[PDB]
Symmetry: C4
Subunit: 32 residues, 4 copies
């Protein structure tokens, strides 16, 4: 009930990791 | 709060898709670019 | 108690808006 | 959960500072770049 807030939280974390992979690709296309 | 927490969770998710999609566009622009 | 989870949530939203301003600057430096 | 929710909130924040800082570095690289 709460348990559901946590689920949301997990889901959030997961988009942030996907954002990190995007930036890893962008960084290389530039030349970091 | 609660009705409230899940209103903020949605704005957050919704913001997160907007960010992923701006990043996807930039990545595709380089490529090239 | 919960009330504190909301506070966190607000804080999260706020970094996402700051990320959006960063990307607005990056987009212009490129030429979107 | 709770002990738990605020463990996930922290990882999330911590991830969010990492993202802001990668973006800041990219922005500074262009500039230029």
């Amino acid at each position: 009930r709460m348990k559901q807030i946590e689920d949301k939280a997990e889901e959030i974390l997961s988009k942030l990791y996907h954002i990190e992979n995007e930036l890893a690709r962008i960084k290389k296309l530039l030349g970091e």
